[PDB]
Every structure is written in structure tokens, then in C-alpha cells.
Amino acid sequence: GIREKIKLVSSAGTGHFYTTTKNKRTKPEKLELKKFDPVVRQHVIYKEAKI
Amino acid sequence: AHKKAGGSTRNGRDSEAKRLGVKRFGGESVLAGSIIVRQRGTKFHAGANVGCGRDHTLFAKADGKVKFEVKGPKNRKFISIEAE
Amino acid sequence: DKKSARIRRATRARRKLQELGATRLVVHRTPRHIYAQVIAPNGSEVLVAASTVEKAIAEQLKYTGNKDAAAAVGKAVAERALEKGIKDVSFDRSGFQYHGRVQALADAAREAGLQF
Amino acid sequence: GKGKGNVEYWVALIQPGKVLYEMDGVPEELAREAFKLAAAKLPIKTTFVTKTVM
Amino acid sequence: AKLHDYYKDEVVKKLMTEFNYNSVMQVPRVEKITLNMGVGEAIADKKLLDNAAADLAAISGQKPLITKARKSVAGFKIRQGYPIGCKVTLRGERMWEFFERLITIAVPRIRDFRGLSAKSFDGRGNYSMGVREQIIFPEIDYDKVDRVRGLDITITTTAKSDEEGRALLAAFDFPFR
RNA sequence: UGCCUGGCGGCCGUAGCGCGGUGGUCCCACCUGACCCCAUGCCGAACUCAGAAGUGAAACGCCGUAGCGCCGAUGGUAGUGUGGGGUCUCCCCAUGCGAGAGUAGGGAACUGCCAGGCAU
RNA sequence: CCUCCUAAAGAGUAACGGAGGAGCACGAAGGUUGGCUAAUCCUGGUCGGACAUCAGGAGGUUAGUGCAAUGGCAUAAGCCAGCUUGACUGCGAGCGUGACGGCGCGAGCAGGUGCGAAAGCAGGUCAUAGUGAUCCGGUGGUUCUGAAUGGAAGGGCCAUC
RNA sequence: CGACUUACCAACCCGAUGCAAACUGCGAAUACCGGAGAAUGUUAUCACGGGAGACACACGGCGGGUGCUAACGUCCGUC
RNA sequence: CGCGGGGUGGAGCAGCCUGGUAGCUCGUCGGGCUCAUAACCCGAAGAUCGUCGGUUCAAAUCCGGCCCCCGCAACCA
Ligand SMILES: [Mg+2]
Ligand SMILES: [Mg+2]
Ligand SMILES: [Mg+2]
Ligand SMILES: [Mg+2]
Ligand SMILES: [Mg+2]
Ligand SMILES: [Mg+2]
Ligand SMILES: [Mg+2]
Ligand SMILES: [Mg+2]
Ligand SMILES: [Mg+2]
Ligand SMILES: [Mg+2]
Ligand SMILES: [Mg+2]
Ligand SMILES: [Mg+2]
Ligand SMILES: [Mg+2]
Ligand SMILES: [Mg+2]
Ligand SMILES: [Mg+2]
Ligand SMILES: [Mg+2]
Ligand SMILES: [Mg+2]
Ligand SMILES: [Mg+2]
Ligand SMILES: [Mg+2]
Ligand SMILES: [Zn+2]
């Protein structure tokens, strides 16, 4: 709906990415999270990117 | 007055019945992980060896026999699994 | 009431422990005395009990209501539990903020040997 | 068909024994005449009853 | 703590002899002193609430709590969570300090002061009195008073009834009438 | 063993509320004071800490009270499964189940474990 | 598609039957730890009232639950605050529900995390709506294949539009 | 600036009455699920596989919606 | 009878579809210029939104009806 779709790409260099939805207007700041990366099997910083 | 008049209705909507209610009744013997009752909100509560899922579905966590009892100060209904 | 609020606070962790089946080291802190009990998972049998109210513990204490009296009573209850072979319990702070006398009792028991 | 109908009048379902009208402060015979006149306007058989302790 | 000592040494004796209390612990105390100001004008300029809270901090020696709307009211154009007042609660030492300051300084500075009402006991023993002007407190500098911020003061007491409450307050030389 | 108190329960109103009284050696509570540990979207109020002067005032405990709440028969009534019957949109009979409300009445809980105090 | 009733005390059950809602929202409104308890009314109180903030009482959850209705909720699922990413990856005993496609619940196991002293809780939200199969394609990984051989094009598998 | 009544309207609470599919501090009969026990029944049960037909129903009884407690009306549940 | 609208100062219209507040013109009132009137000039007031009841903290607005006013349709036999 009003929320767009973004992908959180791993910062561990795997190329793996989670996907999620974000309210662009109300939270313009990018989103960073510590999410598990199965490729390197460690929790690493995941940062926002367009789908 | 010849044929008829006319007039639409605003209703005629409803939803698929969810098949809630007690699945395994008191005295039955369940396998671990058997759903004992699907419900909306903890109408029944989780007693011994009984777990409550997100949709408040009660599932037996141990093999045995179901047992309903009124328990607690609020006279609530608890499902327990007697060890069998 | 203060004790009503304390009971309301305690009830959640008490029920969690009671369904888990853990042997329960329940504390009870008053302005003058600090009591400790170890209770069976059914809740109706007192395994061990150490308190500052009793002479054997009190006579080695200056004031019965401070961190040092709490350490003494925690040491005593832990040693009696180890003599009864209780070994492994779980801590029931009974709503009291885990801090001060209660925490000192907990550390005394942990160092004496009770596992929690 | 095409839905239900519109509300036209309001009724009160009557079962035997229901004490419809009550009256006080009048002589008994005049009460009988008044109740006869009223019952003549109703579609249900009636009877004249009095007050009792229980 | 001057008035606290005066309490414990003379007011207790007066109350014991007067009401024949069987226990000394039955004598009324002073639980708390609450100073409030409802800055209902903050909804236009929020800064007004900050300045009023600064005045209350000057009066009390105690940073205030910013009380917000309990429920949205449209008759006053306030939404839930809008800050619309500031309050302070005083207990013990600062209780007694402010209490003495009030009685023996601020009340005399009230313009045209004739005597505080004895009808302001809320049926239990709590005294609520309204101060129209914050200039009566020397803690506030007159020359910077941008606006006449009032306030209201609630002396909360362990008295069961207004009779006992007002006897306790009057024993403190409280200016009734 | 007796009685009081504290803790953990059992049970969940015959157990709760009201009203009257009573308890401080012990316990508990109020209480005293905040470099402190710890703390209040302000406040040693609460949480916490160091204590113990005083009072059982409040709370709590106990006792007594029926004004309520609560429980509550026997009987009858309503409904109702099966089989029949009637002037059948409602009923009746045979047989089985049998309430709800109400009435008499009961009713100011009872009980286990551990610890402490007192009298032993 | 969701909720109540009809629906005849298990499930299910129709009508152009009687009532209402959905085509989302949230990086926190999620997790955890610690803490707190509502509506309303009365009394007293500067501007300030029927309704603003303050204090006390009665009351008892008659409140709240991001949005409908139901069922729940005091151990709170309601209200604050700290740290946070479990709104994790691979599975999954056993069930429930469907003609099927499918849909749901799920302890436990492995890895690696968050909160807590710890027990423990956490693979989204109190639950039930918030949605569309297949094909055809697009993007990123994957050397699985890659028509003589080595590549590559393409295709497959995994994530996703 | 300052105050009286009434002819009446009526909230809360107290007591007394009724009504409800979308009300419940109560609550059956039946039906349903599970367990044990005999007798009886040509396995009457389930799984797998070959072949189908059928998916226009009708009336009567009991519980209902709709209709006018109308219809050999219409839509349901169970015989 | 069905379906789409409309009800806003004294008259005609906006506003409302995006709930936080009602404007324009004519008219009315007071004064002014005129011997006087009209025109004209300068100031002012005026509707709480058909109506009932909801929703919402707040309803002209959203909703459900109810009342009245227009428009389309009310057919095949
Ligand atoms: Mg339908
Ligand atoms: Mg009975
Ligand atoms: Mg059903
Ligand atoms: Mg049925
Ligand atoms: Mg939430
Ligand atoms: Mg939460
Ligand atoms: Mg929800
Ligand atoms: Mg090749
Ligand atoms: Mg390739
Ligand atoms: Mg009913
Ligand atoms: Mg067909
Ligand atoms: Mg058919
Ligand atoms: Mg048919
Ligand atoms: Mg049929
Ligand atoms: Mg039939
Ligand atoms: Mg019926
Ligand atoms: Mg019929
Ligand atoms: Mg027919
Ligand atoms: Mg037909
Ligand atoms: Zn002087």
C-alpha cells in the first residue's frame, strides 16, 4: 500500500538479502539491522537497499 | 401494480467457519503435539504439559490423557495432560 | 497495599517456575529479618529453611537486616541445601527488586554451591 | 425475495396466564364492566382476576 | 526543618491534649505539598510551559514534572499527550522549608490579604489554596515576570476529617479567617 | 503438646464485604536518616540502603457479629429423548432425564509443610 | 476475505436472510527485563468553565486493546521506561482443516544472536481480515547443466520483483 | 448588580413488573468425542485397486429463516 | 416504486470529495453626496449548515434512517 518494499543487503559481502516493507515518508532514514547471514553463518549488519 | 417493484439488500456477507472448538475431549489419549482445542483467546488455559500457541491453540506437549479441571481463584478452565 | 503489589509482582515468575517444575529458593525480605526457603515443585513441602530470626544464624550477626546478615543467611541456606543434596534450584525473589540484600543473599548462595 | 420487509407495527406475544391490564381504586363491578369493554377490543380470550396474598 | 521541630515539640502536644488521641502516632502529619500550575496556554506557545516551569522551579528549588493531558478534550482543544501543566511534590525537609517560607513570607506579600479560607478542606483534611500572582514569592524576580503565572498549593495531610486537619494547620499559626 | 506470628501452598465467596472489639516480649507494620549501593519522566512518596526511639494510629492478624454477598435442599413447575393421540401455527398421554427461579435452611471457612515466640 | 446471529449446547450448514468491516499499519505499535493499573462521579482548588492541570475519596475495570465484531486479557494481551533485532538460517515429532491446490498450530533438534543475576523468554504484533495459482519474463547469487572441445548464450536451483 | 416558585419534564439509586437471534452472574434433554464390558450382526469397519451412475429432488414429522405463525411457496438441519 | 443527486444568512450560489473554521453577489442597516429619490461612496450586522440518532476528543462535512425538492428508470408480453 503506502509502504514500499526494500531489501536489506548483507554488509558481510555475501550478496544475501532479506526483504521487508518500509514507510518511506515517515521514516526517511535508512534502516540498519543485525540479521543472521546463512551464507557466512554469522549475525552481520544488514543495510537497506531498493528492491 | 403490474409486475413487481424492486429493491436491493445491503447484507449477504459472511466468512468461512473456522472449525474451532474442542478437538480431543476429556479422557482421550493424545500424542505429543496434538491440538486439544482451537479457540479465540484463552477460553481454555494451558495446564500441565500443555502449550498455548500464538492463536491460543492448546496443544499437548507430552504423551498422555487429557484432563479438564476448574482451577485457580477465577474458576478458570485448565487443560492438563496426565502422564500416560 | 505494598504487600499486595509485591504479591502481584511475584505471581508471574512464581507461576512460570511452578509449571516448569523447578525447586524454588524463595526469599522474603523485611526491614529487620531476611528469610530464605527452598521448596519442592509442588509448593506444599518446605525442603530447607534458613532465616535470621533463628539463634544459630543471628548470634553471628550484628544487625539482622543488612547485606551482611543477608550474606550469612544465604550461605547457611545454601550449605543446608547441599547437605540435603538439593544441588539445583531456581531463584524466587518474590517481587523484591533483585538488588541489595536479596542480591547479596543470592551471591552468597551461589558461591556456597546452590546452582541458579 | 429481494430482502426482508419493513417494520410496520409492534406486537407483544401473549401466553396464557399473562395479566395484561391491571386496575385499582375502582369498584369491582365497574372494573368488570371496564375490563369487558377493553377485552372486546382484543383478539385473545381473557378472564377477570383479583389480587391475592400469594 | 524549623517548623518540623516546632511540630514535633509543640504541635504534637497541642493535638494530643486537644483531641485526646490514645496514640501519638494518631496525630496528623503533613504528607506532601503539591504546587501545580495548569499552563493551558501552552497549546499555543509550548515555550510558555517551559517558562512557567522555570518559575515553578525558582519557587520550589525543584525541577517540575510536566503533566500532560489525561484524555483529549475538544472543548479546550487539547489532544492526548499534550503537556498542559507543571507540578512539583515536596516532602520532608524541603516540605518544611517551603512551608515556612510560604506561611512567614509569601502570604504576607499577597496583595490585600485578609485571611485564608477555612472552607478549602476537601472533606478529608487536605488544604487547597490558590495563589493568583507569582510575584508574592521573592524567589521570582518581579522585573522579568513576563506574565502573571498563578499556581495552586495542596497541603496533603493524614487527617481523617476537616476538623482535625484545620486544627493541625492552625496550630502552625496558619492564617485562617 | 497448646496458643500466637511469619513464609509457601491446598482450595476458590458456607471462604468476600460491612459493622463492633482486640494485639505488640517475638513477628509484622508504621517509624528514623540518606557519602553511600540503588532511585524518582519532579519528590528517600515507591524502589533501595543504614538502623532502631516510639505507636499499634493506619494496614494486617484474630475474635464477635446475618445487614448484604455466598451456598441451598424436599416438593412442584418448565423443558425434553423414544412411542402414541388431539378441536395441531399449540398441546395431551405412557415412560426415561429433569432444571432455572424460589422456599425451609446453612453460613463470618477449613487445611498441609517449615520456621520463630511464649507457656510447657 | 474477517466478525456476530440464523445454526437446532461437538464440527459443518442455505436464502436477493438480519447486522457490521478488510484490500492495511508498525523498525516500533516487535523481543526481553524492570516497573505501573482504568472509566466515571463527588469534594477542594489561580486564570479555568459541564469538560485542561493539582489533591482526596467513592467505584471497580461499567476502561484499554492501531482499525469491525466476537472470544479473551490482573500472571495482565492494557500503560511507561532500559537494552535491543528471534520481524533470525536449516529442519521438525505430532496434529487440525480442506475434494484438491493449499492453509494453520507446533514442542523439540542444529547454528548463531538479543534481553535477564538467573530460571527463562524470543523464528513478529491478544487471536481471528489486510489478498491471488500457473505461465511469461526482470534483478542477485549458484560454475548444477552448458548439444565436437574450452568458454559463453541459455536453462536449472536458491532469494526476490 | 441582584432571586422566588411551581402547573410540569425527568437523570441516579431503592423496591416492584415484563421482553430479547445478534443479552447471560444460571442451565437441561438429546446429539457428539473417548474408554471398558457382555450378547448379536453372513465384516456390518478401514485401506488399496477396476467400473459407475448422480450433483433438477418431492412430500410428511420435529427445530427454524423468509412469507401473511399464506401457499402442494421458498431456503436450511435431522429423521 | 428503484437509482443519482440537493437541502448552507432575507434570495441565488460556493465550501464540503482530503472530519479541527462557514464565504461571494444581491439584499438589510447606519452614515455620506442630492432640494429629494435612484444610481454611487464609506462602515456594519446577519446563517451555528433540513432533521433524528450515532461515530469521533471534535460533525455542515463521515454514517445510518426520517422529511421535503429535482433528475433517470418503472420494460417483454
Ligand atoms: Mg449466504
Ligand atoms: Mg435449584
Ligand atoms: Mg454449532
Ligand atoms: Mg447440534
Ligand atoms: Mg502491540
Ligand atoms: Mg508487548
Ligand atoms: Mg489485533
Ligand atoms: Mg560447447
Ligand atoms: Mg549461465
Ligand atoms: Mg439465547
Ligand atoms: Mg449442477
Ligand atoms: Mg442442486
Ligand atoms: Mg433446488
Ligand atoms: Mg433440498
Ligand atoms: Mg424436511
Ligand atoms: Mg427457537
Ligand atoms: Mg416447517
Ligand atoms: Mg416445495
Ligand atoms: Mg420449487
Ligand atoms: Zn515583619
Tab-separated table of C-alpha atoms in Angstrom, chain A residues 27-51:
chain	number	residue	atom	x	y	z
A	27	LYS	CA	10.964	7.283	8.349
A	28	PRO	CA	13.189	8.650	5.569
A	29	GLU	CA	16.322	7.499	7.397
A	30	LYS	CA	17.791	4.245	6.125
A	31	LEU	CA	17.366	1.102	8.205
A	32	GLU	CA	20.252	-0.967	9.588
A	33	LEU	CA	19.867	-4.222	11.488
A	34	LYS	CA	21.869	-7.189	12.746
A	35	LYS	CA	20.348	-10.156	10.915
A	36	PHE	CA	21.638	-13.698	10.503
A	37	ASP	CA	23.509	-14.354	7.269
A	38	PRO	CA	23.220	-18.054	6.339
A	39	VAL	CA	25.999	-17.834	3.749
A	40	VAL	CA	28.605	-16.869	6.366
A	41	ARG	CA	26.571	-18.299	9.267
A	42	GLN	CA	27.121	-15.190	11.413
A	43	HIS	CA	24.989	-12.272	12.528
A	44	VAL	CA	26.098	-9.287	10.444
A	45	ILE	CA	24.924	-5.742	9.780
A	46	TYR	CA	22.164	-5.585	7.162
A	47	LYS	CA	21.547	-2.232	5.492
A	48	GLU	CA	18.662	-1.023	3.367
A	49	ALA	CA	18.554	-1.070	-0.421
A	50	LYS	CA	15.906	-0.771	-3.111
A	51	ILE	CA	14.160	-3.948	-4.218
